[PDB]
């Protein structure tokens, strides 16, 4: 099965998922000098005050916090989106070292980690139908750099002990994802894909310009998670990021000058 090691990592994925060599794959390098400012783009509208988190899960390739998405509780609108997208989960990608770990890069700069907040377009009724549509998902990407601790992340770091191995889950209620946002919502946006199999090209990417800072101690705890299940030989969950893919016929647009 696919993963991030030498015999099953990203360079191998195309044998089981040939869309890996597709026309609108993610992530990409954001060249800040060639991105086009578009005054037509609207500000993002993030409405997370009624979010209901349920659970945190180690899925064997990352950890993810899941939200109740049976109603319009936590939604993203605006920016380049048409319609309403509900939050279903967020997860992270990170490195074995502070100088790598993000999926997107900015002028080839890598960050220590990247947060993905995944939302699906309510017009398609459920997540499984949305991923089959070119405008089915909207993913907010936030970079993490190492510096000062992020208070709103600590609740997450504290429970990782309890979901160390693949398939472990824990109740995780009353977590407010607003504490993970930077001050500014300026963004870049381009059409792309999921960055893990099945790599479907159903995502409008919205990547925030401003990183959030986390402390070395906080990302250290990420690196203690395991890819393996309980009882299996220990393999640390690190470097679970896909490298930048060719931009091909796409335009990155910026909401700012
Ligand atoms: Zn992701």
* 195 is an annotated ligand-binding site residue: yes
Dist CA 62 CA 31 (whole Å): 27
Catalytic residue among 1, 7, 33, 61: 61
Method: X-ray
Calculate how far, in angstroms, residue 219's C-alpha sits from the geometric centre of ligand 1.
16
Calculate how far, in angstroms, residue 125's C-alpha sits from the geometric centre of ligand 1.
22
Q: Tokens 């070395």: give the residue.
A: 216
* 173 is an annotated ligand-binding site residue: no
Calculate how far, in angstroms, residue 235's C-alpha sits from the geometric centre of ligand 1.
20
Joined tokens for residue 82 = 């048409």
Q: What is the domain extent for residue 229?
A: 1-257
Reply yes or no on whether 104 is catalytic: no
Q: How far is CA 189 from CA 105, 146, 159, 168, in A?
A: 13, 24, 32, 34
Calculate how far, in angstroms, residue 10's C-alpha sits from the geometric centre of ligand 1.
14
Q: What's the domain count of the chain?
A: 1
Kindly provide the resolution of this structure in angstroms, with one decimal: 1.6
* 196 is an annotated ligand-binding site residue: yes
**DSSP letter assigned to residue 156:** H
Torsion of CA 205, 211, 214, 219, to 10 degrees: 40
CATH, residue 38: 3.10.200.10
What values do phi and psi take at 187, rounded to 5?
A: -150, 165
Burial pattern 209-218, b for ≥16 Cβ within 10 A else e, equals: bebbebeeeb
* 165 is an annotated ligand-binding site residue: no
Joined tokens for residue 146 = 């190492």
């Amino acid at each position: 099965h696919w993963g991030y090691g030498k015999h099953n990592g990203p360079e191998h994925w195309h044998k089981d998922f040939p869309i890996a060599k597709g026309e609108r794959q993610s992530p990409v390098d954001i060249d800040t000098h060639t991105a086009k400012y578009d005054p037509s783009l609207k500000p993002l509208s993030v409405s997370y005050d009624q979010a209901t988190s349920l659970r945190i899960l180690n899925n064997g390739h990352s950890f993810q916090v899941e939200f109740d998405d049976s109603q319009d509780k936590a939604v993203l609108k605006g920016g380049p989106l048409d319609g309403t997208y509900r939050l279903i989960q967020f997860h992270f990608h990170w490195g074995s070292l502070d100088g790598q770990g993000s999926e997107h890069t900015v002028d080839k700069k890598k960050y220590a980690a990247e947060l993905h907040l995944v939302h699906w377009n309510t017009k398609y009724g459920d997540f499984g139908k949305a991923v089959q549509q070119p405008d089915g998902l909207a993913v907010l990407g936030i970079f993490l750099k190492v510096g000062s601790a992020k208070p709103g992340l600590q609740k997450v770091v504290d429970v990782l002990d309890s979901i160390k191995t693949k398939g472990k889950s824990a109740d995780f209620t009353n977590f407010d994802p607003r504490g993970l946002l930077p001050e500014s919502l300026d963004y870049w946006t381009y059409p792309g894909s999921l960055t893990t199999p099945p790599l479907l090209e159903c995502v409008t990417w919205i990547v925030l310009k401003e990183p959030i800072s986390v402390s070395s101690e906080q990302v250290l705890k990420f690196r203690k998670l395991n890819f393996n299940g309980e009882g299996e030989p220990e393999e640390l969950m690190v470097d679970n990021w896909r490298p930048a893919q060719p931009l091909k016929n796409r335009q990155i647009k910026a909401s700012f000058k």
